[PDB]
Design a protein around this ligand. Sequence first.
Ligand SMILES: O=C(O)[C@H]1O[C@@H](O[C@H]2[C@H](O)[C@H](O)[C@H](O[C@H]3[C@H](O)[C@H](O)[C@H](O)O[C@@H]3C(=O)O)O[C@@H]2C(=O)O)[C@@H](O)[C@@H](O)[C@@H]1O
Length: 308
Amino acid sequence: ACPAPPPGQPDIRAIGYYTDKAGSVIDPALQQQNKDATAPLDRYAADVARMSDDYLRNGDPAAAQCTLSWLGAWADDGAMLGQMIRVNNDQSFYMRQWMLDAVAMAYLKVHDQANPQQRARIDPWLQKLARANLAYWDNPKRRRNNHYYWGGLGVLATGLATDDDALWQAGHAAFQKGIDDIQDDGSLPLEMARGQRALHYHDYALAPLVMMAELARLRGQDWYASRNHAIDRLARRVIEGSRDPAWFNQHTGAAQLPLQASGWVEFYRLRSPDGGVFDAAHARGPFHSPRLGGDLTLMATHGIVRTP
Ligand SMILES: O=C(O)[C@H]1O[C@@H](O[C@H]2[C@H](O)[C@H](O)[C@H](O[C@H]3[C@H](O)[C@H](O)[C@H](O)O[C@@H]3C(=O)O)O[C@@H]2C(=O)O)[C@@H](O)[C@@H](O)[C@@H]1O
């Protein structure tokens, strides 16, 4: 009934594909190279997202058991615990953050179906990945942009799922720095340097901050207020921006590519409706993002976990 997972590959060889300082102009060949190189890794994320999605949607323990089986198999095969091969950037390192986000959110969603044996295999694997990811951001030489907020999510979810309180404080630190990076105009200095993709990267930075906030809401915290409701400013700046890019066009000097707000809106519309600014974007749903935890619509309506 539970199909065979792919072999957990120890090595990642992804490929950065922007050709300009702003990281805004794509080389299509390079975009294709990286896509084919990562396509197996992305198939796995989507599968555990969907199977964990199937469990949250209809309560079937087989969907949760098949998810635990697949995560069980990847831990055992030491998946992505090897070399992050550098082709032309740290693209392989980023994938290990994104994959951790996908595999740890999937685990959290089915964790109440887990028995001690499956816990024994998965936790040390997630924790190895989560500590490996944190240890990249120990170097001060590396700009803590949206990549740091995306790393933060997996580390936080691994902290919550494995109940590793060091990892949770690390995750929270990532979320703190994101909120702290929000200027009074709702903008992020590091994301403002992405020319025509500036608005995309604002939406892209915000989504993992919103997911971390929603993870804190599972532990009975409320991070949303931090720094005098700073997240609402960035939220406003992105949702106003998907409607009207004039501010981003003026502030960066680049004509923005059109953006449709990502699945962070499914939760955020419930936390602070702001008149209902997210209603058009919500109507574009459901939102599927394995890197953010899968079906954001289902999780916003019915919760990330079926029981605390
Ligand atoms: O075709 C898609 O839309 C593709 O998007 C994928 O996620 C992107 C993500 O949107 C984001 O742009 C990210 O950007 C990185 C970039 O890869 C590079 O490393 C740069 O130096 O840093 C950027 C950054 O985050 O600051 O790249 C993601 C990626 O995988 O390249 C996926 O959502 C994919 O499933 C989708 O089809």
